[PDB]
Symmetry: C2
Subunit: 206 residues, 2 copies
């Protein structure tokens, strides 16, 4: 019968078979990384995206995403950045506002002959905390650190004129005080391939 | 008197003086761009960040930011992407959820001898809409478009085995239906400099 036949046709596991393992490699699930790795990623990055919540037409909070220069200040336990982007009203009670900050390193797209193994090399950190606008000498110091970090060798007050009070009045400089963070890496040399489908040609991996 | 002296010392405008203008250049304020420019940016990009809202420990909504491969489908009026990243509960009433998607092109940091003119060349689009998980042939078609877009020349079912039902069961594929969008460019060849402070050395602009 068709029924039985089809059932039979509807009707195995690399997962459990021999492989090589470097014992020094992270055993953390879900691509998660250590707190030290996160620190290092944040220290060497220069561009972040920041998401904060604004009240929308419908009264509901919704997020903006803004790419911007940033600097991690590990002693202070914050990240600093400058932007004059705003919405109408923040969806927030307070003098500070919750903010999520993301920093990534995006490598190469990794081709495969298995469509769900198609990937992209990445390292990515989400930082969760509370951002507050800085004033006066706090703002000037944060802007200096920021500027000097993202322009290595530049010195405010030598390379550039000093940061004036007018500059400060015209600029919004924030400190995002860190509560928690979450880091991920998937930086394979090659995507997982399917042995039982024709291999990718030289054009892909060569 | 000190008072009078200081007042006197506390105590001009390129803004209004001759300049050259290309009449073909956008006159839109605040670095804003046209809808056509936005379309083109989205069509040529491959990486986006998506922000969606999740309920936090404190009951308050907060955003995640996830970098991912995407594809703009202009006829359908959506963007497609695939990710298995989640939180606990979405901060959302519904079978879809509001989502903000950002795509940028980040150029070079632009040095200046004026500290507030330090910048970074960028093009950036925010897309606001509602994302919904796809199923069945809808999911398979979206994943195909996605894969073929970000791997030019790859053909699902030739280059790769076809997308199976198992693949679909293991994958979350979304359509972000576009409501509105917002585009910005600031892609100068050189930052604004201050004439009245020593010029940047050859090391900076050379």
């Amino acid at each position: 019968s068709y029924y039985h036949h089809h059932h039979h046709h509807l009707e195995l596991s690399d997962f459990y078979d021999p492989r090589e393992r470097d014992p020094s490699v992270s055993r953390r699930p879900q691509n998660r990384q250590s707190d030290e790795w996160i620190r290092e990623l944040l220290l060497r990055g220069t561009i972040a995206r920041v998401a904060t919540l604004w009240q929308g037409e419908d009264g509901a909070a919704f997020p903006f995403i803004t790419p911007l220069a940033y600097a991690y200040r590990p002693e202070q336990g914050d990240l600093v950045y400058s932007t004059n982007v705003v919405g109408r009203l923040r969806a927030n009670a307070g003098q500070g506002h919750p903010a999520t900050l993301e920093v990534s390193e995006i490598g190469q797209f990794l081709p495969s002959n298995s469509p769900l193994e198609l990937s992209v090399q990445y390292r990515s950190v989400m930082v969760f905390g509370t951002a507050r606008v800085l004033a006066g000498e706090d703002a000037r110091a944060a802007l200096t650190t920021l500027s000097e970090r993202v322009f290595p060798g530049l010195k405010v007050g030598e390379t550039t004129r000093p940061i004036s009070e007018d500059d400060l009045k015209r600029t919004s400089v924030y400190s995002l005080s860190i509560d928690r963070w979450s880091g991920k890496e998937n930086w394979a040399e090659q995507a997982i391939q399917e042995e039982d489908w024709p291999a990718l040609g030289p054009e892909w991996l060569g």
